[PDB]
Structure formats: structure tokens, C-alpha cells
Design a protein around this ligand. Structure first.
Ligand SMILES: CC(=O)N[C@@H]1[C@@H](O)[C@H](O[C@@H]2O[C@H](CO)[C@@H](O)[C@H](O)[C@H]2NC(C)=O)[C@@H](CO)O[C@H]1O
Ligand SMILES: CC(=O)N[C@@H]1[C@@H](O)[C@H](O[C@@H]2O[C@H](CO)[C@@H](O)[C@H](O)[C@H]2NC(C)=O)[C@@H](CO)O[C@H]1O
Ligand code: NA
Ligand code: NA
Lengths: 528, 528
């Protein structure tokens, strides 16, 4: 009747709010009554809360499929029995091809409906099972955690722990991955995460000395489970940290439950978990899609007969109780580049929380320092302690510099006796320092009274005391406006007294000529 | 004729070894002669070297599609012209649905065929364009870099820079991602990487203060380009580092060239590149799938008319030459956990290379130290310098401990006067210390001559000087073997002189009775 939360190891099982689902291998998942769920599933997730009718608006809800042949009242009664047996029933938000698209300001209405349904049906919490576009559509990444923090606190004020769990597909758990916001904002509020280590085909990770470990590789399943979990529980190898006491391994029940990810030999899981326990970081449990699948039939109409809970139930429940990782969280620490001579403040952007979600940002301290007057790497150490633990994390701050740029320094032709200003159209700038046009000197001059080619060297001085320097060159050609005889052409015919220009001189033909180059005809030739 | 490599900014364009490709929007990509490729494509990649016929074995090759109507000799002639124009022609290995599956030991034959084709056709290098399963199938991740290092060195010994490039889909570039091995092994050998920032739909990254930036989001394309590139060129946000001078932005030419990723407003790219240039890290160029697409038609038979090179050619070529990032690389530095009192060696696993691929692992130094006799976090700093740069990277080493475990401490029933050894079947162990069975004491005793319940407390002492302690309890019940009268039952009928056992006593009926509990019938009732 009241909020029944789990503090030991869990075996989580999703329950279909529909009948006769088709399997990836042509099997069939019947709907089942909640009360027929194997007792060793101590968390059962009602699938799914979603938007049923966009006529009702943007806020998802839950409507029982009547063809399961449970009345509203009976379904409440069966939740009530599971609760009386010390088992939890969660409402799972989302699902494959569920379309949730909330906008900022929707969070109060989402919190209110979660509370309505929880109090009506007797749910013990909520599983965030957003998939595909729903993870990142409109403002889901802000609205959902915001509503859920209001729900957690509403029930905390009556002494209840409304459970919050999540089922992210595992590749979304990398460090800046799509599920980041949900984990960081609900750090301290969530009870455990049960990612899906299924339906991701060849995705996985690279491990030195082993190679690439794919989620679809049966020959290395033990490796897959160990290494991805090890990465998760320590926040290594490009994964967000989920403490081991809050990490629940999500799996398909059988080959019909999912395209890939099914564990053919359960020994690979026993062995992985064991190795994790041997390094002092045992996991919190397992999760499966789904109890209907575990109670279904394959394509030959053979019953799966509870094979999943047969393989894992006892193995998970016979573990020691979990030991809470109470280490605090640090957030916002990223390697950063800082321009030479900028102001850098080591605390901007950085926050912290204790293992229960409380802001402890002012408790953070920093060791080491950055000199933004000198280029290079500076390494800092952040620390914060709470509940007799400390978390430390390092940060690399690189001080760099930026070249300024010249503009307007392009070769040009001007007419004899015009005015020429070497700085007209020339300028320089720098991102920080801004305008550096006054920092340009010019070596050389142009004499526009005298035809020819004039070279100018432009020197830009910048930075501290103008001791850095950039150089560019430019050619200014002074031409006459006076026109003159036509250029000689090899293909033309000339006659006596025709004049031509060629190789800077004016030549006069002495007689008929074609093809004779002025200057090449000697003392007594056709060109004079 | 000879190896023509590029040292300025590049605009890379792939060339189809086939005719009339179908577009994602029903357009058509004709085959084209190499010589008709727009000159501003200064790198043209022949697509694709692959396994054409598994009868020929596992080693990929290149066979010209004859229906392009170029003879072998003419195609060589057209490569020769591009080369005479100072433009590079690469052979692209792989392609969408190309099946390459090499095994270890294949690398000499792969190196020999790359050299054959290069010398035959006049190619100037190779682009690694493995996709899907080819990235990680059999030992591709070892064979391919191994063959290519042999190819680079073969040509280095005749004064040629055989170019090596890669086209990984961008999500494979995260820190332990599938393309890791190719980048790390060819660090120093590759000329630039041109990832594909297309065909990944909603993939992208999370940026504080902006939100989720998807590769398919047109409204934030500028953000997508800036932030993913910024992440790449600095190795932040869970991406491998690719120096900015070696990063070339890969794009679709138009909407028919790819499912998603096309830049509708080129201004978003100009602006992104500009911002990157403003922080002193301008990119090396752009890449496109493909020149045939840029020269194709859409579904309405309208010519695309070179729209891609129109939008980017001048913009990329008018940038300043690249400035080589000569900082060295560090590899293997990962946060690690170490058991209390183990030996930790800070250098095991760690390697380093200079900006040209040379091993400089012995030049690495480490600052700070780890005390494995005390639990906690220890922060180290690795550094190595080469070519007047230094790279620094930090590492967190956590010293942890592990509980031992008891076994055999389970409640038990033994028969009066049997032998009882409190340690039979009891033991303890620890991962490190091993057997701790000799470290168990027992408080309390069992007297098997006297019926009843005996409690035993088992204490395990361990760790340094046995000053840590674990406790477990056990109940040993000593029962008689002597049988006695049957237990009274509420539902049975008894008669005078029937005897029953109940609440530890033997009672005798005085007369007919059913339902009368022995001990409840007073002084003169039926039970005596
Ligand atoms: C936690 C979890 O596994 N969630 C997802 C499930 O939704 C999904 O199952 C599929 O859900 C649909 C509704 O969301 C159903 O229409 C569909 O029948 C069902 N498919 C099966 C085989 O039961 C599973 C699929 O493996 O994975 C997640 O994506
Ligand atoms: C660098 C690159 O973009 N490589 C891939 C390409 O192969 C791929 O194009 C497709 O390649 C096939 C052969 O590998 C062709 O059969 C197919 O026609 C072709 N498709 C198109 C539309 O040209 C592109 C697709 O965008 O991306 C990579 O996956
Ligand atoms: Na409840
Ligand atoms: Na060549």
C-alpha cells in the first residue's frame, strides 16, 4: 500500500502493459498478471508511462491495457500484494518508440501527474527509460530531472523513499553522452541505474591486451561484462561513474527479448561479477527485459519457462548486502585553454554534491595555480570531502597565445604623381588586444614622381611591451599615364617608318618586316 | 608521376570507382573522368580498395571499373596530370559494405600490394575508410597499421612522404572508441584525419550552457562544428586528440550524398572555422563525399553544379598555411586502482612518441608518488618533452582494500554425544593474503553430552598485524536420538491412557478428548 523501496540486491524485471508481443526470433510474449511474476523479481517495472493521446497534451501518463483483463481495482490489488511481500513496483517512463517532448515549465505538471499515479496505483518509484529521440527531444533533459527532484522531495517529507532508477542504453553513458544530464542532475536522488547492455550490436570498448570487446561477441561476453562494468563503476575509459552499489546489469531474458545482447552461457556473468567482487566492487544486481519474455514462448511454441530467473535469481540474491559508496561528486572539471594574460578563476563552473545530492560546492578546495602571464600547461587538483570520504580530480589548464592579423597589405599599382599613403587600407588586430593599427611601422618609401617598383616592409609590433613582431611585404608599382607606340608583335607586318615599343625602347622599321624582333637585327638590320 | 603530398590546407574529394550511384533523395552520381575534377580539390581519393573476389584471398586490392570507359593506361595518365598540377591522388581503403577481414601475419602481403598499386598507378598515399564491422573485424586493427607503417618507411627511404589519412565516422573517435588503435599506432605516420561528420543522425555531444548538439540539427550546425572540432583538437569531452593542423572536416556534398549531415547554410561553417582560428587552432581543411555527388543531379534531374566547392573551395584555400603542432604524445595513462600493500610501478604500461612517431618512452618522467601501504587517491603527473614542446598528463591511482570472506559458518544440528569440531568445514580467505583459516578464533563451546542450543561467535583477524576483524555467528543444536510419544494434535482424538508430548512434557489422557490442549486443562482436567 505504501512506498516499498529496496535496500538489498535487486533483480529487476519489466512488465508489459500489452499482450502478445512479437519476438526478435518470432516468439511470443503474453501479457501476464502481476501476481504470477516470480517472487525473486523484487523490482517489477510497469511498462510504460507515455503520451497516449496528444489530444490530452504533452504530459505523459499511464493507462492500463484493458485487454490484460485486469480491472483498475484488481491491478491496484496485485501491486498491493507485491508490496505486502516487500517487493517494489515502479512505473517505467518511455519505452522504445514512445514520444515524449516536454518544454521547460512542464515540470510542475509532470511532477503532479507522477504523484497522482503513484498515490492512485501504489507505485514505489519511477524508471527513466527514454530511448532514441526522446532522450534529447525539446527540453526533456531539463524537465524530467526537475519534475523528479520535486517528486523525491514530496515523498521525503512524509518519510518515504520514492525510488528513481534509469535504463539508458549503455553507449549513452559516456562522459559527455546524451544521458549525462540525467545522471548529474539526479546524482543523490537515484537509487540505482540499470543500463541496457543489449540491442547495440557491435558497440563496446577497446581494452589493452584484449582488443575490441563488442556487446554482440559471444566469445568475449565475460570480458564485455567485466570491463564495461569496471569502467562504469570507476568512471574510466570514457564512461560516467555509477557507483557499484548503484549499478544493475541490464539484460535480455532470451533471444526473442532483444536483437543482440543475450548471454548464452551464464557462467560468463557469474565470473564477471565475481571478478568485480574480488576487486571490492560488487554490483547491485541484474535487470531484464522482461518478465513476460521470461514467461513466453519461442517460435516453436516452446515455453521459455523462467530460464532467466533460473540462471540469475539465486546467484544475485545470495550476495552480501550492498555497502554504500558515500564518496562525494565533483562536476564541471574539464581541461580548459586560457589566453595569455586573461583572468582565470579556478572555481568558475565547478560544483559538488555529497552522496545524497546536497550541494557542497563551497566545500571544494583547489591545489596548484595558473600563471596566465606565461604560456604552458598548469595542473590543478580539486578536492572535496563529505561523510568521511574525499573525492579528488585533476584539471589541466593550458595558457596559449594567438597571432594577430594584418589586413590590406596587397601589391598595388598607382599612377605617376598621385598621392600615396602607405597606411591607407592597412590595419592589424588581435582577439584580446584589439586594434593594432598604431603598432605598424613601414620600412621603405614610394616615390610617385618616378616610374618603377617600390618595395615596402610592414612590421607589426605587439604583445607585452611590443616585443613580438610580425612582418609582411608589399610591392607598389608607379606607372606612367603617358601612352606610347604599340607593342611589337611577332605575328604582325610592319613597313618603313612604322614605330613599335619593345623591351623598353621605341624602334622604327627601315623596310618591310614580319617576325623580326627589335634589338636582334644588329647594326644595319630592319629595326633602328 | 612521383609521390605528390600536400603541405598546405586541403579540400579532399572522394572519387567513385563506379557509375550512376543512387542518392539518398533519389538523385544520381555519374562516374566522371579524374581530369574533370575541379582543380580546387587538391586531394582526390579513389574509392575503393577492397576485396573484390574472395577467390583471390583476404588481401584487398583495386580494380578499375571498366564501365567508366577509362583504360588502365588512361587512368594512369589522368593521375599523372593531377600530379603534374601538384594535386594528390589517394587510394581509399574500405567503403560502406566493404568486407575486409585480415588476420595477423597478413600485414606483409597487405604492405606489398599497397606498394604494387602505388607504383603502378602513381597513387600518393592511402585513406583508411573502414566502416561498420570492417573497423574491428578479425585483426584489422593490428594488420592495417602494421602494413601501413611498413609502407610509410619503404617510401621514406627514397625521400617520399606516402600520405596516410583516415575517414572515421566521428563517434568512433571517442577515447576508447573503435578507431583508437588506428590513431595511436599511426601517431606520427598520418598526415591528417578527415572524419565523417555525417550519417550519424542524432549523435553528437552535450555542451554546458548550450545543451545537446546533434549532427542532424540544422539550427545548431555552427555549434556542432565548433564544439566537436574543439573537442577533437584538444582531446576533450571524451574525444581522442587530433591536432588542429591535422584535422579536416568531413561533409556531404549535398542532400543526395548522405542521409544526414549536409550543411544547409555554409555561413555556419565559416563561423565555426573562424572561431577555431580565433583561439589559435585553425583546421587543416574540409573533405567531401564526394566529387561525383558535387557533379551530379538531383531527383528532378537538376545539376548540383559544383555547389560544394563553390561554398568551401576559396574559403579553405584562402587560409594561412598550417603551423605544425609538434607536441609529443603520451599513451597508456589511465586511472588505476591498486590493492593496499601491492607493488605499483608508475611506468608500467606507459609509452610516448614525438610528433613524428618516434618512440620516446624513456624520456618520460613522473612527479608525485603512491604509498600502497595506505588507502586513498594519489595524483601523479607524467611529462615528456621533445622538439621544444612538453606534454603533461595527470593520473589518479586509488589504493583500495578488499574484505576477506568466511565460509562454512552455517547453523547446524548434531546428535547428542557425537564429536563436534567447531572448525570442521570453516575457512576464510582473502584475494591477496590468501588462506586465513588459521586466523579464525571461536568464542563459546558446544557440549554434545547436553541437549540444547549452543551459540558460537567466529572472529576472523586479518591484515597488517591482524588488527582488522570480521565476525560471524552460528547456532549448533544438540538433539537427542531418543524417540518419544507423539506430539499432541488439536485435530486428533485421544482416550484414557493415551500419551502425548506437548510443550516439552509427556501427558496422559484421563478420558475421551479432542481439541483440549495439554497444560490448559487445570488441576482436574483430561490431561495429566
Ligand atoms: C528497458 C527496455 O528494454 N526498454 C525498451 C523496450 O521498449 C523494448 O521492447 C519493445 O518495446 C515496445 C514498446 O516500447 C514494444 O512494442 C515491443 O514489442 C518491444 N519488443 C519486444 C521484443 O518485446 C526492448 C526490446 O529489446 O528494448 C528497449 O528498447
Ligand atoms: C568516406 C565516405 O563517405 N565513405 C562511405 C561511402 O561508402 C558512402 O557512400 C556509398 O558507398 C557505397 C560503396 O561503399 C556505394 O555503393 C553507395 O552508392 C554510396 N552511396 C552514395 C549515396 O553515394 C557514404 C554515403 O553517404 O558514406 C560513407 O559510408
Ligand atoms: Na507501493
Ligand atoms: Na603520384
Amino acid at each position: 500500500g505504501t512506498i516499498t523501496s529496496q535496500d538489498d540486491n535487486v533483480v529487476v524485471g519489466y512488465w508489459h502493459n500489452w499482450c502478445d508481443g512479437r519476438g526478435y526470433q518470432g516468439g511470443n510474449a503474453p501479457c501476464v498478471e502481476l501476481k504470477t511474476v516470480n517472487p525473486q523479481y523484487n523490482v517489477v517495472n510497469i511498462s510504460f508511462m507515455k503520451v497516449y493521446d496528444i489530444a490530452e497534451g504533452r504530459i505523459p501518463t499511464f493507462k492500463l491495457d484493458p485487454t490484460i483483463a485486469l480491472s483498475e481495482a484488481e491491478f491496484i490489488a496485485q501491486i498491493d500484494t507485491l508490496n505486502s511481500q516487500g517487493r517494489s513496483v515502479l512505473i517505467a517512463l518511455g519505452g522504445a518508440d514512445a514520444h515524449i517532448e516536454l518544454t521547460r515549465g512542464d515540470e510542475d505538471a509532470l511532477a503532479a501527474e507522477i504523484i497522482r499515479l503513484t498515490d492512485l496505483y501504489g507505485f514505489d518509484g519511477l524508471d527513466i527509460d527514454l530511448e532514441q529521440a526522446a532522450i534529447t527531444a525539446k527540453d526533456n533533459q531539463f524537465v524530467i530531472p526537475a519534475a523528479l527532484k520535486m517528486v523525491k522531495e514530496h515523498y521525503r517529507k512524509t518519510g518515504d523513499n520514492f525510488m528513481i532508477t534509469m535504463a539508458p542504453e549503455f553507449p549513452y553513458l559516456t562522459a559527455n553522452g546524451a544521458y549525462t544530464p540525467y545522471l548529474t542532475e539526479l546524482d543523490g536522488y537515484y537509487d540505482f541505474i540499470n543500463p541496457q547492455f543489449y540491442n547495440q550490436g557491435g558497440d563496446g570498448l577497446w581494452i589493452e591486451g584484449v582488443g575490441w570487446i563488442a556487446q554482440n561477441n559471444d566469445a568475449l561476453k565475460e570480458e564485455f561484462i567485466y570491463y564495461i562494468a569496471d569502467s562504469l563503476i570507476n568512471g574510466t575509459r570514457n564512461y560516467h561513474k555509477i557507483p557499484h552499489d548503484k549499478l544493475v546489469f541490464g539484460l535480455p531474458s532470451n533471444i526473442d527479448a532483444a536483437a543482440t545482447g543475450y548471454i548464452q552461457d551464464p557462467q560468463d556473468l557469474y565470473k564477471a561479477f565475481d571478478r568485480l567482487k574480488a576487486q571490492g566492487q560488487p554490483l547491485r544486481g541484474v535487470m531484464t527485459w522482461s518478465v513476460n519474455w521470461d514467461m513466453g514462448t519461442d517460435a516453436a511454441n516452446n515455453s521459455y519457462n523462467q530460464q532467466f530467473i533460473k540462471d540469475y535469481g539465486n546467484f544475485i540474491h545470495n550476495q552480501l548486502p550492498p555497502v554504500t559508496d558515500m564518496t562525494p561528486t565533483l562536476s564541471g572539471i574539464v581541461d580548459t585553454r586560457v589566453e595569455l594574460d586573461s583572468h582565470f578563476d579556478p572555481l568558475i563552473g565547478i560544483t559538488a554534491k555529497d552522496y545524497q545530492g546536497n550541494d557542497i560546492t563551497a566545500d571544494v578546495t583547489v591545489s596548484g595555480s595558473v600563471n596566465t602571464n606565461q604560456v604552458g600547461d598548469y595542473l590543478l587538483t580539486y578536492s572535496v570531502s563529505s561523510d568521511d570520504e574525499t573525492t579528488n580530480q585533476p584539471r589541466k589548464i593550458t595558457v596559449y597565445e594567438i597571432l594577430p592579423a594584418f589586413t590590406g597589405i596587397t601589391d598595388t599599382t598607382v599612377v605617376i604623381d598621385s598621392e600615396f599613403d602607405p597606411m591607407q587600407g592597412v590595419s592589424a588586430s588581435h582577439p584580446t588586444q584589439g586594434d593594432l593599427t598604431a603598432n605598424i611601422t613601414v620600412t621603405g618609401e614610394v616615390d610617385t614622381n618616378v616610374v618603377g617598383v617600390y618595395e615596402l616592409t610592414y612590421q607589426l609590433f605587439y604583445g607585452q611591451d611590443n616585443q613580438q613582431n610580425m612582418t609582411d611585404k608589399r610591392i607598389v608599382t608607379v606607372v606612367t599615364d603617358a601612352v606610347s607606340d604599340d607593342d611589337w608583335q611577332v605575328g604582325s607586318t610592319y613597313v618603313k617608318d612604322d614605330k613599335v615599343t619593345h623591351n623598353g625602347a621605341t624602334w622604327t622599321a627601315q623596310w618591310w618586316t614580319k617576325g623580326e624582333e627589335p634589338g636582334t637585327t644588329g647594326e644595319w638590320g630592319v629595326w633602328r
